Amino acid sequence: LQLLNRQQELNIAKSSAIGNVRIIDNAVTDPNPVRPKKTIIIVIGVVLG
Amino acid sequence: LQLLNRQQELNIAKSSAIGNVRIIDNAVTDPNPVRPKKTIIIVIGVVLG
């Protein structure tokens, strides 16, 4: 099974029509969390109450 | 001799007739069943009652 997977990986590679890939921005983490959104949660709580 | 050359050409063409179809992800089974959807069934039962 591992050799079949390796053969498939090579075969799928060889058909690729894209040139050399150029990493522009490596990953960095935004220090401000995207969730939870505190203010909208508190406003929703107030209005629901 | 021309027929033999054509025979060789047909042999090499038939051998090198790789298709334009590739298998990227082979099948794996999602362990979480898709049916029945218990919660929607129970809620439908409640509302129908």
Token pair recorded at residue B14: 């038939």
Map tokens 């979480």 to a residue.
B32
Give CA–CA dist A8/A2, Å, rounded: 10
Overall resolution, Å: 3.0
Q: Is A12 on the interface with B (CB under 8 A)?
A: yes
Question: What tokens were used for A5?
Answer: 């997977």
Q: How many CB atoms lie within 10 A of CB B24?
A: 7
Helix ranges (DSSP H) in chain A: 2-14, 38-48
- Which residue in B20, B21, B22 has the most chain A C-beta atoms within 10 A of its own C-beta, making it the best mutation to test that interface? B22
Asked if B23 and A15 touch (Cβ cutoff 8 Å), the reply is no
Residue B45's alpha-carbon distances to B26, B36, B42, B49, in angstroms, are 39, 14, 5, 6
d(Cα B33, Cα A45) in Å, to the nearest integer? 35
Q: Which residue of A has its CA nearest to B19?
A: A15
CA distance B18 to chain A (A): 11
Q: What is the CA radius of gyration of chain A?
A: 24
